[PDB]
Design a protein around this ligand. Structure first.
Ligand SMILES: [Mg+2]
Ligand SMILES: [Mg+2]
Ligand SMILES: [Mg+2]
Ligand SMILES: [Mg+2]
Ligand SMILES: [Mg+2]
Ligand SMILES: [Mg+2]
Ligand SMILES: [Mg+2]
Ligand SMILES: [Mg+2]
Ligand SMILES: [Mg+2]
Ligand SMILES: [Mg+2]
Ligand SMILES: [Mg+2]
Ligand SMILES: [Mg+2]
Ligand SMILES: [Mg+2]
Ligand SMILES: [Mg+2]
Ligand SMILES: [Mg+2]
Ligand SMILES: [Mg+2]
Ligand SMILES: [Mg+2]
Ligand SMILES: [Mg+2]
Ligand SMILES: [Mg+2]
Ligand SMILES: [Mg+2]
Ligand SMILES: [Mg+2]
Ligand SMILES: [Mg+2]
Ligand SMILES: [Mg+2]
Ligand SMILES: [Mg+2]
Ligand SMILES: [Mg+2]
Lengths: 127, 99, 152, 100, 208, 83
RNA sequence: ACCUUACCUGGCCUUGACAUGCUGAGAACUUUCCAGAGAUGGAUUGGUGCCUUCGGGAACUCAGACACAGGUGCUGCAUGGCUGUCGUCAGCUCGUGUCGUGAGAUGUUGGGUUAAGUCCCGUAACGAGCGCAACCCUUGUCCUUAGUUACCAGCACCUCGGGUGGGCACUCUAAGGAGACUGCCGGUGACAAACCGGAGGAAGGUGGGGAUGACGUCAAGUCAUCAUGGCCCUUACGGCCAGGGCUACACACGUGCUACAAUGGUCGGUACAAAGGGUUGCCAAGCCGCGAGGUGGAGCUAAUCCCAUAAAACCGAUCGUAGUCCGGAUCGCAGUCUGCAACUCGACUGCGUGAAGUCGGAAUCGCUAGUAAUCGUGAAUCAGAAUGUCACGGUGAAUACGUU
């Protein structure tokens, strides 16, 4: 039984396990509301479930580590999508059009020598 | 029971040393718990290159330290010591534990 | 740019109204990366809108947006001695962006207690054509139609 | 990088290493929790009797090749613009240009 | 424009470090200082012997010095009365005991450092730099030496103004990281000032 | 301020001179360079010439300037005014 | 702060703080003394040492005589080396041939195309070189190898802690590989180079970022990092010491930091990082103080222990537009720590005071996506001293019709 997905987002990673169940959801062994408190993180972590309309049928066990709250939510979504793909591997198109299977490669640009930030410069008075 | 810790400034020769220790241990009939690559240590420096005032003209350098771990089970022949001139040859720091 | 290579991004995720336009409005009211604060401000303003009366707050929102997007815009151009100001029709995408920018900027400077109250007042007043934003729109329209000679 | 500068920093290092332990117990006596005021005073006067140019705080480490007070690195012993010369030739083991 | 040291940027790719040992924070600086001092001393004493590469290895509490030279007979003469004296001396400098072996460099004229040695010596002997640089390029390119470049900068001759003159032959790709460019710099201390000599030599590409 | 672990800080030679100067009462100033030394409560009523960087300035010590240091009564910069 | 240190005031040495050469006399050291601001000088219990061809000698110490040493003194327009700048701009040349009496030209011009002198097609030019691109590091997906100090899917116990037995599934760490090549399809195109779209894929059109700086330019910067030609001082332009200065202050300019508040200030409750440093070191648990901190000594030569609590964000309560529960400068009092020593002239802590400041004239700067904006963390230098420098993550926008 079960299915395993590995999601990754913004220096954060997530291990997700899908089993037969009734949508229990548990992240780091605590409830979804206790983890993502009143924001769109619930929406983003649930998106593939309702798009595939299998929110009620799967029991989910998640362990996430690294990054910030939004990055962790993105990791959960990515892992969930990959595990859902491997479960019933015929709806790759359905997620593909939604852009969930693609892994976002954006990362924090490094600081450069002589500059303040990665791109900001000092003021440049010419006189 | 004995454990080996290996330290070097580059990966080629540390890999060679791990391979030779492992193959000697396999030949001598003992068991080996697989080599473990410990995370490398990277220490960086940023140095000015002009002899005088040019602050934005810098140049960056780095030193990496690579660490490997071996350990053996069921030992009866002790010639890993006997290769004291050969297990470490040029630039490998080797630490032995549970001798 | 010269190369004409810019590609538009797709990040648009209204959580609990499922309305595509409110996410962009919250992006406009956001300052310094604090999505949650702007989120709260907009939702509080919409709660005030829905509790003043019977109108659907979202519907009042797009009614105000329609009643505030300009139709024509004035573009300056120096002709060799004087800078004239031609009129030109506004692209469909630029209308909503201009509308939101004006609405937020004018709600910034009203002077009630909280920013949510300022925004709610602006939506109520501009929903029939009485706010500062609507009269700015009228100023732009008259300025554009007073230069109809060039137009082309 | 006068030769006199290097000579007198060498003198300072020799003389600070000369005692190097009397200072230790004298500081221990002064900072001891329960040591009586008289022992505190005797330790203070004895420690102040020592030559002024004998404390570790007066040592300003310099380039061991040129004696440049500035741009010193303690991982190596070299200053700013001898380290680059040594590192370009490949003399310094482990040092390479890095980008990350 | 200012270039980058070709030996420096090719470390870990085609080139190798002169000193190969591992140390920790206890004694890294001591070993580095010892290596620099012994290299300076060895290059200072036996200049007559044409020595270019001096590699240092440090196994546990021991040192091995390998010297690249074009005159094995001079350093090791009539059974080597000098190699043993040098061994005791270098053991006096270094803390650890020292082991020495001499590895001669075939084709001395193909080594960049030796070419720089010769050009600087000729410029000391008031030889016209025209002829010296031409002959160096010719002797190098006659055998092997798939590319070469020589540059001489300073008060050439005795002119009361300093210029740079350089001669090139073959192909010398400096922006290619696979090229095993051998580079050398040296100073000639003449009667009017210093003259700098730079030599690039390109052997060929490396794959695998 | 110095910690209270060691109450005062006083130089050995200056302290010795001060303690000598009480057998016969205040008659002559004590010449010194030690600006770092704090005035003790029991050298009041005696005159000390402290170094300045060019000469020694004489200071007559009274009870109200006890907890300070000698260098606090010798200005090392002049600044007679821009205008 | 002293030292750095190169400057000033005063005290003091002349083969000298340092090198070699000569001679004579002795070991080095250890002695808890006195005078002096110190430099220094005079006293000073102890063994006068080692190797002996027993003729003496080595190292080390002291005194004399000269050759000398010494100089952060001048010249960067006498130089080497190193660096900025145009500019990461796409250019700069050469060999042979040909054209012109010659300087020169051709190649390198022309139609397209490209990030590109990138490529195709023509062409009295045929080739080559340095540049461009590739090779290099890192990040984005997958596979093998390995599972400790890292991990916990399945099993057993569990004080309910990966804590234990154990597992090689996973995350992760680090070596080797696969992958992306306009590869496949449609259309345009001189059925060429190439361009516009599409499918598949983690990634699509040099995927993102970095290192990489052509011939030369500015007699650009550096003689003070170093090296060095010539000139200059040698009872001082050399050397040693103690105080002071580099921190001055009617003013003007450059770069930042903190604010002028309600997308905010205080109090309580709670969640999630990356990277890095530690044996002349980090410095816990317990205890004592409102606090900086003090005692204590566990663990760690470190994926093990320590630095070490991330903050903004979320929830609750209060303030209700006031020079204020905003802002924090300034000053008074009392302390802690480092250090021989915090007066000139250190960093922090407590109590009190509470300034200018209501979004800033003419003018002017940065930024095109994980970017700007904003929030915190670490290291180098370092006894102590960062609003600077160099790195690291969290949240996360607006806009680009177009080249007038
Ligand atoms: Mg990064
Ligand atoms: Mg300006
Ligand atoms: Mg010198
Ligand atoms: Mg210091
Ligand atoms: Mg010059
Ligand atoms: Mg110049
Ligand atoms: Mg020059
Ligand atoms: Mg050209
Ligand atoms: Mg030509
Ligand atoms: Mg020609
Ligand atoms: Mg002709
Ligand atoms: Mg031409
Ligand atoms: Mg063309
Ligand atoms: Mg080309
Ligand atoms: Mg696709
Ligand atoms: Mg496509
Ligand atoms: Mg390139
Ligand atoms: Mg460069
Ligand atoms: Mg000039
Ligand atoms: Mg100048
Ligand atoms: Mg001084
Ligand atoms: Mg200054
Ligand atoms: Mg306040
Ligand atoms: Mg750009
Ligand atoms: Mg950042």
């Amino acid at each position: 039984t079960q299915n395993y997905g590995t999601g990754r987002r913004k220096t954060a990673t997530a291990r997700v396990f899908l089993r037969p169940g009734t949508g229990k959801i548990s992240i780091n062994n605590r409830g979804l509301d206790q983890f993502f408190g009143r924001e769109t993180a619930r929406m983003v972590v649930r998106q593939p479930l309702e798009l595939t309309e299998t929110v009620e049928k799967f029991d989910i066990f998640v362990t996430v580590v690294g990054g910030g709250v939004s990055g962790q939510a993105g990791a959960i979504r990515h892992g969930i999508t990959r595990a859902l793909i491997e479960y019933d591997e015929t709806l790759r198109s359905s997620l593909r059009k939604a852009g969930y299977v693609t892994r976002d490669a954006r990362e924090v640009e490094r600081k450069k020598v002589g500059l303040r930030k990665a791109r900001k410069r000092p003021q440049y008075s010419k006189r | 029971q004995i454990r080996i810790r290996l330290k070097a400034f580059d990966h080629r020769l540390i890999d060679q040393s791990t391979q030779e220790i492992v193959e000697t241990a396999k030949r001598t009939g003992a068991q080996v718990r697989g080599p473990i690559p410990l995370p490398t240590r990277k220490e960086r420096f940023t140095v000015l290159i002009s002899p005088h005032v040019n602050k934005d003209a810098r140049d960056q350098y780095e030193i990496r330290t690579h660490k490997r771990v071996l350990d053996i089970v069921q030992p009866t022949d002790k010639t890993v010591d006997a290769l004291m001139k050969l297990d470490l040859a040029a630039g490998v720091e080797v630490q032995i534990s549970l001798g | 740019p010269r190369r004409r290579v810019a590609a538009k991004r797709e990040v648009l995720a209204d959580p609990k109204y499922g309305s595509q336009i409110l996410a962009k409005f919250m992006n406009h009211v956001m300052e310094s990366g604090k999505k949650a604060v702007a989120e709260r401000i907009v939702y509080g303003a919409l709660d005030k809108v829905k509790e003043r009366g019977k109108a659907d707050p979202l519907e009042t929102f797009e009614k105000a947006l329609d009643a505030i997007a300009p139709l024509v815009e004035v573009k300056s151009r120096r002709v060799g001695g004087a800078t004239y100001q031609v009129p030109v029709e506004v692209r469909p995408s630029r209308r909503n962006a201009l509308a939101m920018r004006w609405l937020v900027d004018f709600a910034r400077k009203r002077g009630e207690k909280s920013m949510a109250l300022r925004l709610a007042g602006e939506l109520l007043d501009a929903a029939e054509g009485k706010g500062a934003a609507v009269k700015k729109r009228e100023d732009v329209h008259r300025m554009a139609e007073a230069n109809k000679a060039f137009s082309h | 990088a006068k030769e006199s500068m290097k000579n007198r920093e060498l003198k300072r290092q020799l003389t600070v290493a000369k005692y190097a332990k009397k200072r230790a117990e004298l500081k221990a006596i002064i900072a001891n929790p329960n040591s009586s005021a008289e022992e505190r005073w005797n330790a203070q006067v004895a420690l102040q009797k020592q030559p002024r140019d004998a404390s570790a705080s007066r040592l300003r480490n310099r380039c061991r090749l040129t004696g440049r007070p500035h741009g010193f690195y303690r991982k190596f012993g070299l200053s700013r613009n001898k380290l680059r010369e040594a590192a370009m030739r490949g003399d310094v083991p482990g040092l390479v240009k890095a980008s990350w | 424009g200012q270039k980058v040291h070709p030996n420096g940027i090719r470390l870990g790719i085609v080139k190798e470090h002169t000193s190969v040992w591992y140390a920790d924070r206890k004694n890294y600086a001591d070993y580095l200082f010892a290596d620099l001092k012994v290299r300076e001393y060895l290059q200072d004493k036996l200049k007559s012997a044409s020595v270019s590469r001096i590699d240092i290895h440090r196994p546990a509490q021991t040192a091995r010095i390998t010297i690249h030279t074009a005159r094995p007979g001079i350093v090791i003469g009539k059974k080597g009365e000098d190699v043993e004296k040098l061994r005791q001396d270098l053991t006096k400098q270094m803390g650890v005991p020292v082991h020495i072996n001499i590895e001669e460099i075939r084709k001395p004229e193909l080594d960049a450092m030796l070419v720089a040695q010769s050009v600087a010596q000729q410029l000391e002997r008031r030889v016209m730099f025209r002829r010296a640089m031409k002959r160096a390029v010719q002797n190098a390119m006659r055998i092997g030496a798939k590319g070469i470049k020589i540059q001489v900068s300073g008060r050439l001759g005795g002119a009361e103004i300093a210029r740079t003159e350089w001669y090139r032959e073959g192909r010398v790709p400096l922006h290619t990281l696979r090229a095993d460019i051998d580079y050398a710099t040296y100073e000639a201390h003449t009667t009017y000032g210093v003259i700098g000599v730079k030599v690039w030599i390109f052997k060929g590409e490396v794959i695998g | 301020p110095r910690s209270l672990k060691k109450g005062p800080f006083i130089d050995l030679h200056l302290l010795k001179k001060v303690e000598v100067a009480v057998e016969k009462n205040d008659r002559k100033p004590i010449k010194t360079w030690s600006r770092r030394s704090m005035i003790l409560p029991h050298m009041v009523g005696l005159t000390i010439a402290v170094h300045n960087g060019r000469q020694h300035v004489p200071v007559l010590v009274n009870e109200d300037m006890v907890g300070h240091k000698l260098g606090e009564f010798a200005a090392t910069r002049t600044y007679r005014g821009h205008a």
